[PDB]
């Protein structure tokens, strides 16, 4: 089946510019109270989620320097310590991961 | 590239026209444009109107004070013989007064039942800034006007049209000058209603005062016709009844608009400015 006639630009503007074709404005946008950047109400902040992944990656690179190979996971808990911190009362008998950096303010010691 | 010159030249002309439409130039005085001789254009002005103007007087009817003051400013900058030119102030005062007293006489004798307030508002409309400037821009009065600013302001143009009447008054006299006011100013209220030139408010309160002067009982309003009362498009005909005698009847969408138009209809009959009135007589005086 082939077109019997050529469709005019008037017919085609009415199909292309139909409200269903148009992009719909979004009203679920708001500002992140921490950084001030934009975000959706149901989605995490891309900026704050990015700074968590940069630090999480650094911690995961230190974990590799301790295991020193594959299939070498521990059977104990793990703790992250920063310059100016020592094992806590509850952080006894764990795998401490030393980080040469000041503890992030958002990263609260538990 | 095709050889030839006629099509390229013809295409440049269409481009110029297109450019002018997209970017039209500012208007300028006709004297600045080519093919202009002030002395030849001012003689034709009179012959065109079949009047024996006086050139010395007519040339000063187009000279305005604003143009004289600016003409001096140009000389001071260049350090340049004194000018003895006179303005049109004196000529304008003579023409404006004569026009107000001649229009009144014409109207006071044609409509003898109209009050002075109505005859004054009519004379203030025929000698108005809108009417006098329309007659001036169609009699070549704005092309000869020696003003400082173009386009000529309406007030400046109004003062120049009455100076031409003052020059004609001195040259040809009142009788010949009164015909110029009948043929150019009286003809500006032919297809116009009375209350379209003489705007009033509360016409019903004005009709009650004219019926007291004639010792006539106050009018009573009543409904003569009616249609579509409940609808959005109604029609009412209200009739004014003095001593149970119909004097006027007017239509309207509401009962208040129709009652106001009926009073306007009665006033036109009282003053004799109806549509049925016989036309103004322009025939040569016997």
């Amino acid at each position: 089946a082939a077109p019997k006639n050529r469709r005019t630009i008037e017919v085609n503007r009415c199909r292309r510019r139909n409200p269903q074709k148009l992009i719909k404005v979004k009203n679920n946008i708001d500002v992140c109270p921490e950084c001030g950047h934009l975000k959706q109400k149901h989605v995490l902040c891309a900026y704050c989620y990015e700074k968590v992944c940069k630090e999480t990656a650094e911690i995961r690179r230190q974990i590799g320097k301790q295991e020193g190979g594959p299939f070498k996971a521990p059977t104990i808990e793990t703790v992250v310590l920063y310059t100016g911190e020592t094992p806590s009362e509850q952080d006894q008998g764990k795998r401490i991961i030393e980080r040469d950096r000041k503890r992030p303010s958002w990263f609260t010691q538990n | 590239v095709k050889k030839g010159f006629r099509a390229a030249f013809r295409f440049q002309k269409e481009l110029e026209r297109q450019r002018l439409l997209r970017c039209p130039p500012p208007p300028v005085r006709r004297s600045e444009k080519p093919n202009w001789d002030y002395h030849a254009e001012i003689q034709a002005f009179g012959h065109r109107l079949q009047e024996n103007f006086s050139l010395d007087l007519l040339k000063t009817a187009f000279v305005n004070s604003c143009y004289i003051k600016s003409e001096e400013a140009k000389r001071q900058q260049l350090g340049i013989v004194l000018l003895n030119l006179k303005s049109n102030q004196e000529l304008s005062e003579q023409g404006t007064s004569f026009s107000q007293t001649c229009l009144t006489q014409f109207l006071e004798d044609e409509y003898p039942d109209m009050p002075t307030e109505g005859i004054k508002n009519l004379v203030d409309f025929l000698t108005g800034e809108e009417v006098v400037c329309h007659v001036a821009r169609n009699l070549a009065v704005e092309q000869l006007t020696l003003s400082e600013e173009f386009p000529v302001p309406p007030a400046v143009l109004q003062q120049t049209f009455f100076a031409v009447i003052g020059a004609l008054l001195q040259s040809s006299g009142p009788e010949r000058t009164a015909l110029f006011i009948r043929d150019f100013l009286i003809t500006q209220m032919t297809g116009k209603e009375l209350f379209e030139m003489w705007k009033i408010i509360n016409p019903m309160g004005l009709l009650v005062e004219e019926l007291k002067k004639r010792n006539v009982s106050a009018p009573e309003s009543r409904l003569t016709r009616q249609s579509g009362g409940t609808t959005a498009l109604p029609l009412y005909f209200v009739g004014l009844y003095c001593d149970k005698k119909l004097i006027a009847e007017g239509p309207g969408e509401t009962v208040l608009v129709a009652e106001e138009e009926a009073a306007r209809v009665a006033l036109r009959k009282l003053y004799g400015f109806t549509e049925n009135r016989r036309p103004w007589n322009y025939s040569k005086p016997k």
């Binding site: - | 093919n35 001789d37 009699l139 015909l179 032919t190 249609s227 549509e275």
Partner: protein, 150 residues
Amino acid sequence: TARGTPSRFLASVLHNGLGRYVQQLQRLSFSVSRDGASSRGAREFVEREVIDFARRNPGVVIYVNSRPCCVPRVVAEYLNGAVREESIHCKSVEEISTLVQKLADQSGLDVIRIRKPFHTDNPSIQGQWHPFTNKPTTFRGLRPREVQDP
């Protein structure tokens, strides 16, 4: 087009002819060439015809600019401000004499479609027709099947 062009109603300039007739043609500007076969008919019109035409029309200012040109034209300006430009290129004297006279007779209003061949500001003298013109009035202005004094 009529639909592809504009229109106007029949009219006059300042109610011309009502009190007096005023010629609307105000200026005529000829552009002839001393040399040039296109302007031959225009040169002979300037030698014998234009002078007699100005005597009859003293209210029209005529300008004759003789300059080099390939297409002679006559520009007519009217009181109302309209400007009509026309070409007398390769036209005989008789053709230019009937054209210039046509310009003198015209008013300047645009030569376009005229809707009606008549115009009047006072079309009625007995009253414009309206629905109640030929209807009789009823006692007490009652309506069809309307109970009075209920």
